[PDB]
Amino acid sequence: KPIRALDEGDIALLKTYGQSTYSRQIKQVEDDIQQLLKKINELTGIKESDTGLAPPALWDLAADKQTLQSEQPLQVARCTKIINADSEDPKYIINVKQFAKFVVDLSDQVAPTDIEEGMRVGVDRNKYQIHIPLPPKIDPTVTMMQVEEKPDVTYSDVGGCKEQIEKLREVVETPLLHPERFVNLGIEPPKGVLLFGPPGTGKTLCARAVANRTDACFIRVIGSELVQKYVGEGARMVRELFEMARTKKACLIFFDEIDAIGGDNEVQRTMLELINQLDGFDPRGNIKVLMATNRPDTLDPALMRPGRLDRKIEFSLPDLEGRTHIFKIHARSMSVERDIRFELLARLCPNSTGAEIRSVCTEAGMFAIRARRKIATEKDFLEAVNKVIKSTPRYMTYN
Amino acid sequence: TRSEYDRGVNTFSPEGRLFQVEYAIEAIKLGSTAIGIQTSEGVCLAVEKRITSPLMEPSSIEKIVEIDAHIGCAMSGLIADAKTLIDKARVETQNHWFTYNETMTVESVTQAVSNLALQFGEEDADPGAMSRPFGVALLFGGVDEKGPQLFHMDPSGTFVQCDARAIGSASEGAQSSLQEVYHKSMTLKEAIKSSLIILKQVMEEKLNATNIELATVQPGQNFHMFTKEELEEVIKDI
Amino acid sequence: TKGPDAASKLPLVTPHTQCRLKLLKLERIKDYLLMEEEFIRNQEQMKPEERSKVDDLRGTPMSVGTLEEIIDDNHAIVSTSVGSEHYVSILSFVDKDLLEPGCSVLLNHKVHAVIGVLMDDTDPLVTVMKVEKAPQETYADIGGLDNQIQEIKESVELPLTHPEYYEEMGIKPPKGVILYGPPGTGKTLLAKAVANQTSATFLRVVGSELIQKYLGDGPKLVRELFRVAEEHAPSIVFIDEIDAIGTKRYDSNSGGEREIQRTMLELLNQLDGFDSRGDVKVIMATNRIETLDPALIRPGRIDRKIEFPLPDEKTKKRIFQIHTSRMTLADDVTLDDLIMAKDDLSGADIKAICTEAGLMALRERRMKVTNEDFKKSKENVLYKGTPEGLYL
Amino acid sequence: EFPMPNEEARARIMQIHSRKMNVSPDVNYEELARCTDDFNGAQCKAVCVEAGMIALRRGATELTHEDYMEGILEVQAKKKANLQYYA
Amino acid sequence: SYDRAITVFSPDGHLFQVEYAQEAVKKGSTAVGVRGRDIVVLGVEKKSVAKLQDERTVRKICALDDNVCMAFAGLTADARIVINRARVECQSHRLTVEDPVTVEYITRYIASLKQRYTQSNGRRPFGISALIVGFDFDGTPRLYQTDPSGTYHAWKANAIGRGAKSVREFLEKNYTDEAIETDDLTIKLVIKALLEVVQSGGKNIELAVMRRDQSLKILNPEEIEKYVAEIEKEKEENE
Amino acid sequence: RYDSRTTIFSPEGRLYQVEYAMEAIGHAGTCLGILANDGVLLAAERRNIHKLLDEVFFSEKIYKLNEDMACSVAGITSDANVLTNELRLIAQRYLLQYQEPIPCEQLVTALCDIKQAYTQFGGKRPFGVSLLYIGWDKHYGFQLYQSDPSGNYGGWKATCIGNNSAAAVSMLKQDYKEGEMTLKSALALAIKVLNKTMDVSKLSAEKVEIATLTRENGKTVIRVLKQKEVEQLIKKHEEEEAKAEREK
Ligand SMILES: Nc1ncnc2c1ncn2[C@@H]1O[C@H](COP(=O)(O)OP(=O)(O)OP(=O)(O)O)[C@@H](O)[C@H]1O
Ligand SMILES: Nc1ncnc2c1ncn2[C@@H]1O[C@H](COP(=O)(O)OP(=O)(O)O)[C@@H](O)[C@H]1O
Ligand SMILES: [Mg+2]
Numbered sequence A: 001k002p003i004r005a006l007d008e009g010d011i012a013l014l015k016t017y018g019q020s021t022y023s024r025q026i027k028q029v030e031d032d033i034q035q036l037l038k039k040i041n042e043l044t045g046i047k048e049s050d051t052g053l054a055p056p057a058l059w060d061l062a063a064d065k066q067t068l069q070s071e072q073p074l075q076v077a078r079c080t081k082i083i084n085a086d087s088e089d090p091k092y093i094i095n096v097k098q099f100a101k102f103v104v105d106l107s108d109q110v111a112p113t114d115i116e117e118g119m120r121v122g123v124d125r126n127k128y129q130i131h132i133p134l135p136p137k138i139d140p141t142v143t144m145m146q147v148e149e150k151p152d153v154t155y156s157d158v159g160g161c162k163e164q165i166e167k168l169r170e171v172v173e174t175p176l177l178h179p180e181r182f183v184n185l186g187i188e189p190p191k192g193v194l195l196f197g198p199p200g201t202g203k204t205l206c207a208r209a210v211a212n213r214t215d216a217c218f219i220r221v222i223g224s225e226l227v228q229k230y231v232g233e234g235a236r237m238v239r240e241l242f243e244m245a246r247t248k249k250a251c252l253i254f255f256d257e258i259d260a261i262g263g264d265n266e267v268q269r270t271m272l273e274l275i276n277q278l279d280g281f282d283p284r285g286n287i288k289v290l291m292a293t294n295r296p297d298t299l300d301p302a303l304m305r306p307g308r309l310d311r312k313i314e315f316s317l318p319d320l321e322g323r324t325h326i327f328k329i330h331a332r333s334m335s336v337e338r339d340i341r342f343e344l345l346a347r348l349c350p351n352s353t354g355a356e357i358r359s360v361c362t363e364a365g366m367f368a369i370r371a372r373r374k375i376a377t378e379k380d381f382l383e384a385v386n387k388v389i390k391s392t393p394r395y396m397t398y399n
Numbered sequence B: 001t002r003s004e005y006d007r008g009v010n011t012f013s014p015e016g017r018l019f020q021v022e023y024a025i026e027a028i029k030l031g032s033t034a035i036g037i038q039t040s041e042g043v044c045l046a047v048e049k050r051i052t053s054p055l056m057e058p059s060s061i062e063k064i065v066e067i068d069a070h071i072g073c074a075m076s077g078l079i080a081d082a083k084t085l086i087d088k089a090r091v092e093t094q095n096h097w098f099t100y101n102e103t104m105t106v107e108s109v110t111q112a113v114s115n116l117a118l119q120f121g122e123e124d125a126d127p128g129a130m131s132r133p134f135g136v137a138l139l140f141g142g143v144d145e146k147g148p149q150l151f152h153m154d155p156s157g158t159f160v161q162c163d164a165r166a167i168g169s170a171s172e173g174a175q176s177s178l179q180e181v182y183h184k185s186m187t188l189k190e191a192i193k194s195s196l197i198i199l200k201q202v203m204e205e206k207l208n209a210t211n212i213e214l215a216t217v218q219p220g221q222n223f224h225m226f227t228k229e230e231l232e233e234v235i236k237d238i
Numbered sequence C: 001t002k003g004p005d006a007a008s009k010l011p012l013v014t015p016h017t018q019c020r021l022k023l024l025k026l027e028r029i030k031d032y033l034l035m036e037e038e039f040i041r042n043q044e045q046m047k048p049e050e051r052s053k054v055d056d057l058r059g060t061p062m063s064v065g066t067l068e069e070i071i072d073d074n075h076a077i078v079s080t081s082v083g084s085e086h087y088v089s090i091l092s093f094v095d096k097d098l099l100e101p102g103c104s105v106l107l108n109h110k111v112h113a114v115i116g117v118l119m120d121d122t123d124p125l126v127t128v129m130k131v132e133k134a135p136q137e138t139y140a141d142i143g144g145l146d147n148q149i150q151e152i153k154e155s156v157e158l159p160l161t162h163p164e165y166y167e168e169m170g171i172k173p174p175k176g177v178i179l180y181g182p183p184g185t186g187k188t189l190l191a192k193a194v195a196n197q198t199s200a201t202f203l204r205v206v207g208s209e210l211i212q213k214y215l216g217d218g219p220k221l222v223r224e225l226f227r228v229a230e231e232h233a234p235s236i237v238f239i240d241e242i243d244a245i246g247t248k249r250y251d252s253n254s255g256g257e258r259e260i261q262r263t264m265l266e267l268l269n270q271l272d273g274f275d276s277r278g279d280v281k282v283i284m285a286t287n288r289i290e291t292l293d294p295a296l297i298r299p300g301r302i303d304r305k306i307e308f309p310l311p312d313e314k315t316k317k318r319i320f321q322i323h324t325s326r327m328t329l330a331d332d333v334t335l336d337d338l339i340m341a342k343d344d345l346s347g348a349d350i351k352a353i354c355t356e357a358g359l360m361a362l363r364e365r366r367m368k369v370t371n372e373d374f375k376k377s378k379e380n381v382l383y384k385g386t387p388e389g390l391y392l
Numbered sequence D: 001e002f003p004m005p006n007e008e009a010r011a012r013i014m015q016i017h018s019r020k021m022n023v024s025p026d027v028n029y030e031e032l033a034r035c036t037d038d039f040n041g042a043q044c045k046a047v048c049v050e051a052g053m054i055a056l057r058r059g060a061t062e063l064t065h066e067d068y069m070e071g072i073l074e075v076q077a078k079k080k081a082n083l084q085y086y087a
Numbered sequence E: 001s002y003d004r005a006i007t008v009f010s011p012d013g014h015l016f017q018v019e020y021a022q023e024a025v026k027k028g029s030t031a032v033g034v035r036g037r038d039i040v041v042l043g044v045e046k047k048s049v050a051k052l053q054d055e056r057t058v059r060k061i062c063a064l065d066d067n068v069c070m071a072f073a074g075l076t077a078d079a080r081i082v083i084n085r086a087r088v089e090c091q092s093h094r095l096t097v098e099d100p101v102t103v104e105y106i107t108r109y110i111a112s113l114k115q116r117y118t119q120s121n122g123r124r125p126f127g128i129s130a131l132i133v134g135f136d137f138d139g140t141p142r143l144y145q146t147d148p149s150g151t152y153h154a155w156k157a158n159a160i161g162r163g164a165k166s167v168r169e170f171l172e173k174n175y176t177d178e179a180i181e182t183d184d185l186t187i188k189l190v191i192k193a194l195l196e197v198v199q200s201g202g203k204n205i206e207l208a209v210m211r212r213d214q215s216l217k218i219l220n221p222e223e224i225e226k227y228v229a230e231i232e233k234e235k236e237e238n239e
Numbered sequence F: 001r002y003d004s005r006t007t008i009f010s011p012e013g014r015l016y017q018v019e020y021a022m023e024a025i026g027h028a029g030t031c032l033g034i035l036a037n038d039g040v041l042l043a044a045e046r047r048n049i050h051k052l053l054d055e056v057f058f059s060e061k062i063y064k065l066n067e068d069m070a071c072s073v074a075g076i077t078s079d080a081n082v083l084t085n086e087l088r089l090i091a092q093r094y095l096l097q098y099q100e101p102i103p104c105e106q107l108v109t110a111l112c113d114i115k116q117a118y119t120q121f122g123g124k125r126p127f128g129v130s131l132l133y134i135g136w137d138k139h140y141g142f143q144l145y146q147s148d149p150s151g152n153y154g155g156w157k158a159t160c161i162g163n164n165s166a167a168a169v170s171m172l173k174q175d176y177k178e179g180e181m182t183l184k185s186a187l188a189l190a191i192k193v194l195n196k197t198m199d200v201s202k203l204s205a206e207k208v209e210i211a212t213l214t215r216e217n218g219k220t221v222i223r224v225l226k227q228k229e230v231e232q233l234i235k236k237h238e239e240e241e242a243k244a245e246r247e248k
Helices: A008-016 A023-044 A061-070 A162-177 A179-184 A203-214 A234-247 A266-280 A320-332 A342-348 A354-370 A378-388 B019-030 B079-099 B106-116 B171-181 B188-202 B228-237 C020-045 C050-058 C124-128 C146-156 C164-168 C187-197 C217-231 C255-273 C313-323 C336-340 C347-363 C371-381 D008-017 D029-034 D042-057 D066-078 E016-027 E076-097 E103-117 E164-174 E183-195 E224-238 F016-027 F077-098 F104-120 F165-174 F183-197 F227-247
Strands: A074-079 A092-096 A100-104 A120-123 A130-133 A192-196 A217-221 A251-256 A289-292 A311-314 B034-039 B042-047 B064-068 B071-077 B136-144 B147-153 B159-161 B164-167 B214-217 C062-072 C075-080 C085-089 C104-108 C114-117 C177-180 C201-205 C235-240 C280-286 C304-307 E031-035 E040-045 E061-065 E068-073 E129-135 E141-146 E152-154 E157-160 E205-210 F031-036 F039-045 F062-066 F069-075 F129-137 F141-146 F154-156 F158-161 F208-216 F219-224
Touching (some): A061 C050, A074 A130, A092 A120, A162 A179, A162 A192, A162 A311, A162 D042, A192 A203, A203 A217, A203 A251, A234 A251, A234 A266, A320 A354, A342 A378, A342 B171, A342 B188, A354 A378, A354 C146, A354 C164, B019 B071, B034 B071, B034 B136, B034 B147, B034 B171, B042 B136, B042 B147, B042 B188, B064 B079, B064 B136, B071 B079, B079 B106, B079 E103, B136 B164, B147 B164, B164 B171, B171 B188, B188 B214, B188 B228, B214 B228, C050 C114, C062 C114, C124 C217, C146 C177, C146 C187, C146 C280, C187 C201, C187 C235, C201 C217, C217 C235, C217 C280, C313 C336, C313 C347, C347 C371, D008 D029, D029 D066, E031 E129, E031 E141, E031 E164, E040 E068, E040 E141, E040 E183, E061 E129, E068 E157, E076 E103, E076 F104, E103 E129, E103 E141, E129 E205, E157 E164, E183 E205, F016 F069, F031 F141, F031 F165, F031 F183, F039 F069, F039 F129, F039 F141, F039 F183, F062 F077, F062 F208, F069 F077, F069 F208, F104 F141, F129 F158, F141 F158, F141 F208, F154 F158, F183 F208, F208 F227
Parallel strands (some): A217 A251, C177 C280, C177 C304, C201 C235
Antiparallel strands (some): A074 A092, A074 A120, A074 C085, A092 A100, A120 A130, B034 B164, B042 B214, B064 B071, B136 B147, B147 B159, C062 C075, C104 C114, E031 E040, E040 E205, E068 E129, E141 E152, F031 F039, F031 F158, F069 F129, F129 F141, F208 F219
8 A cells, every 4th residue: 555645635634633712713813822932031131230340439430540550460380390499590491371481580579599390480470580479378168178177076076987987086096095005115106197088988987076075176178179170279279287286286187089199290209399398397297197098909009108198997898886886876856766776777778878877868868848747757768778778589588 | 909809718818817707607698587596495596577568478578487396597609509408408307317317506507507518619519519618607406415506607607606696687786786785694574575676776667566476485485486466476576 | 150041931822812912912022032033133233462362372273172181380281082091281371270171171183182161062962952842831831740740840940949958947958859650641841831931951861861872972972961951050850761871770781782881870970079068950751761770860869759540530631621721622522421431541542532532623624622623533533451340 | 129028028018017006016917918929919918907906996995906817818808708609 | 709609608608609609590481379267279470472373382381180280480401391290190199199299299309309409519409489279188278389409388379480589579569368269369469460460461470279089170261351350340340 | 703503692692693594595496385275285396407307306495294294395405304304204194193184383383393403502513494285184274384494383274385476475475365265276376376486487396396185075186286186277377367467
């Protein structure tokens, strides 16, 4: 049966034949609706942006004219090798962002002492001479460097990592709390430890707990930050943060997600600067560094060499007692019943990380919300662990 | 790289561990909890049914089976592997009753069953036998000339006298509870109450008639599996 | 911050049966549109020093740059769109409190001193990435997926509407949700339905759209998108086809792969940037969930994972009812033989079956689809297992 | 060729890695050396480090050789398996 | 890895080959068996023969002995082999003990055979699941389900093959004590369970019924239409 | 992957080696058989006759198994010979034990059990051979069964296996009038199928192998169509086709 193309007569008949009497009117009205909407959107338009003009009470217009005429604009550049200035070769390599690199002299305003390698130099636009160093002035409350003084989490909050928390206690407390014992045992206090374990194990939380116990401020540094836009002057970032830590009292330096940094030119500058701030800075200081990443090998081989990071604490997935302790800790902040079998939930989620446990508790809360109940039940936790964990076979051949 | 030592039971790890036997051990954690307690008045066995469907006939699920009138069994692991183990246990008990015309002790029962086990790595399997470790843990209880006796059998073939042992998906928690709730002169009735308490505390579902099979062996009576009404009587107290 | 600029959302006409009531409702909407246009035009018609001097001081033209640092109240570090950045001054009339690293400062063409700030800079890409006309699809147009719709409403709607339960229970609202499943299951349709019913700003993103040729343009585009989402709060960001950039992280060698990794690390960082209590949620869809990075789907980043299984028999018949709800079917069409046939029919496959059946009906010079037309259509649209005989 | 430290080479390594700790003459490096069979170099450094660590663990009890003994026991094998099915 | 080895435990203690063989049943065809007070029924979904296949030799329900029947799902050839072995063992057991084989014994034999076929390399597991039905010589209704793993279980009314989960839920929601009061009620139950998945009715359905020791006759294609007509009559009666 | 020895199971449950044994039959010569009211026939294609084959033979594809049994082969030649020898062995063993010609169902089940045993266990490659058994019995008169490398089988009235078997069986089922075909109509249908399924405008009698089984006067006679007979049949079909096309 060959298909027959719809003839013009068939097209005409099929269009009209059986149709609503109102169909023509409906189609016309709908098209007019679209045209009218387009017309409204055309005739509203031109929304005023109203740029950031302050009230006229603050305009010293003459002064702005004078600063426009006088004050020169300086491009921002990254400095490089000093090329042995020593008043005989006052020249430096400066990389003016994407524009280019140049070799430039100083300005009468600046001095050689405050200009070195690596900081932000404000070069002019004609001769490109460095006219003012601009330290990044980072002190970053707009981003990472947690700078939390006394983290809310405590020794009770961390659960399961008892061996881990004990090893951490030793290393970052026994020198910190009892320096005399290490002094009279004839050994330099532990220079640092690399807290390695599968992600989500809670190593960060355990570190913050000991920080709260030590009453020493906890500094957490991310790596992706200085992999992304804020690259380059990261050496000056760590310089200033270590400096303020020296100004600060007993401290606790903690590098998480440092795998990104360890795994490299400006990055290499960052770790040789921290070499200068760890080996060059006396190992007797109270700015103990707490290294922590899942990768135990991606760290640069020159980092864990003796006279530097000295031991390694191996965090592992929490056990049954650990899992039930984490469950109780996370459920304390939830509206649940008092007879929840948290040992049962810990059993039902073997080889489950702490993050998985908090997600299970969150899903239990959502399940309780689903039935519009103000209190989560054990059935909700069972369904939550059925959903999160496991992302007939185990019921018909095993028994 | 543990994978090269993973494959096969005849391979030694650098740490000397039998990884396939360890996996058979861990395969017990996929079986329903079984609890057995040793008392001077006898031994009680309590298990978790884990009923898949209310339509299923409960009598088919055999967590507790009778090897002999004087001995009881509790199981946790693969149903098939157990079935073979239980058949061998019964056959060996009847072999002892034939040759020596005496009731063979539960220690010798678990010895023979372990003899059938731990035979995965052996050349006597040419006519046909297990080339892999048995993946079922055995809880043997009964009364013999040494009074009541309870023995737990390890999939590797290891057996130990246990005053109170719990096997299954919840061996750790139930064992931890039995660690502090067990007492030497504990009576059989309070022992059964304690066992049901632990099972209720550790069960995923609520305690009823169809979630537990209960067995008991005392020097006077023979092997007794608690019927429905006896289960209701023992479960109303808890 | 200014509230959510949602879509237009013209009122829905309920009958849709080409009857008088549809005419009444459509004519009412047209009437209101006419009285709106009359008012806007007539009010356009009816009724008609320092600012000019400050415009003179600004000069002509004025370049647009992004503020990055502020050293003092009269100096800052702006960056032109090219990529170069300068140590420039801030003139007095520039309202200072609006200056915040990441804004869009207005720079003088010569000596690029800051002469103003632009509240709305949104580049054409992020501007078109914002939904203006809500899609006509609705939850009524979705057959089945009751659990999926329920989860998405719990995730991106319940915190938006009355959220007191979330902090009553003490659990955080689910920051971000990802949809996965075989192609054509309803992942994009369920996002259209969300956009139709939303009360927040909806930002549709292709995923592959974020990648840009010029260096630093990708992360800048992602940053601008999420900055708009936050500034447009509450808002919903729908990054469809996340696997376009969500693939497994691997060490990069070429510059382009480095830029791709930079764009995704920026997206991940900015997903971490806002708090879950914030009213900006992300929605991502993909077919190859297994090929995603096991860090974008971390429980601390995207807790929820809504599965979209191939529709079952009752969902299949629901979808068939939905897509045949506008057909003039006969009384003979059973529609049960088709949902019987154990196949991998999806929502897209069912819709195509309906369209093909309509085309068969047209092929017979009839406008009433019959069972035979559906029968031939199912075979026609189904393309491409176990040999017959092995498995009885 | 770098051979495995034999016995006195083991003693020498132990000695060298222990001169910066206030270790008393009460210790006996030769006994530790004859208890360092199969040990190779850096293992002895780990022995010294762990001996100091438990010397702290005993309560900062400086002047001890029993710490060197326990350190010789643990080293890399400090984790104790507690593995079942082994008689 | 740990999947391509029948006698290798996975790190999580799974014999993945056995589970794959078990899952191979789900690719078969639905077969539901229900036992009643005096009847046991075997409902299977019959594949529609296109134009030439002889339905006489596409046997899905087969009788091991005069007192036992079974329906399989998952692999025709393995099914045929296990059927032949099961009838050989039934005859051998009647030779050894002279009394007819109880359903439990033949089910145990089938399970043990499949088990011994899944305990060594070079022996692929029997990728079928069997629904053993029949009456013991004392006259009791027993139904058994055998798994490719080599285990067996007692079910009052179970379903195997594809869509077996849906039929399982149907039976859970519809198996009542009064639903098996009469043979016709059990037939209605099993037909409804089948139509839950095979909605066409009429054809694509094969039933075998066993009353008390009559040498079961499979419902021939003259009253299956009559029984489905009665089912439809009741279906319009209550609605 | 899971494409190792046949005693393996894919996670989805497929027996990939068995599947490859299935799909391998598509490389074999096309053979078909049709059930008529008062006779059965086997039509097979001689895919390999180059120039210098002796044709010292009774039939290559068709193999007679018993005074009531005949079958056509499609697969590897070695497995073909082994399976045919086993077929003769089991048929004669049944004849010796029971003093009665073996039923088609029983013999087919025996061979299929052997084939399943060759894929059930042992680490042995399954027989990559598909068969088409033709025979008669008092139990069901004339029967046609199509075997399978997996060890399955089915009772058919019209079936084609080999290359282009799908199209051949599709058109055959489109053009089969069950219960109303004699031997002549079945022969014409088989010739038309071989014409439409083989890669020749005018197929020759040499490339065609036809054997007919017919029960008459108490005994069943299995005869292969002689060269003159098959030539007459194909010429009758080509003049029928010429009449059909000139009428159109
Ligand atoms: N549950 C459903 N009910 C009704 N229609 C549906 C359903 N699921 C899918 N469809 C139909 O399928 C069409 C395509 O679906 P959609 O765009 O949501 O696919 P998708 O899963 O996002 O696919 P992809 O990931 O391959 O791009 C929709 O236009 C809709 O008509
Ligand atoms: N031992 C523990 N006790 C309590 N909470 C834990 C523990 N381990 C992990 N968590 C939970 O994990 C979450 C954060 O994990 P995090 O410390 O970032 O993992 P990582 O080990 O990668 O640093 C917190 O919400 C915390 O409550
Ligand atoms: Mg899509």
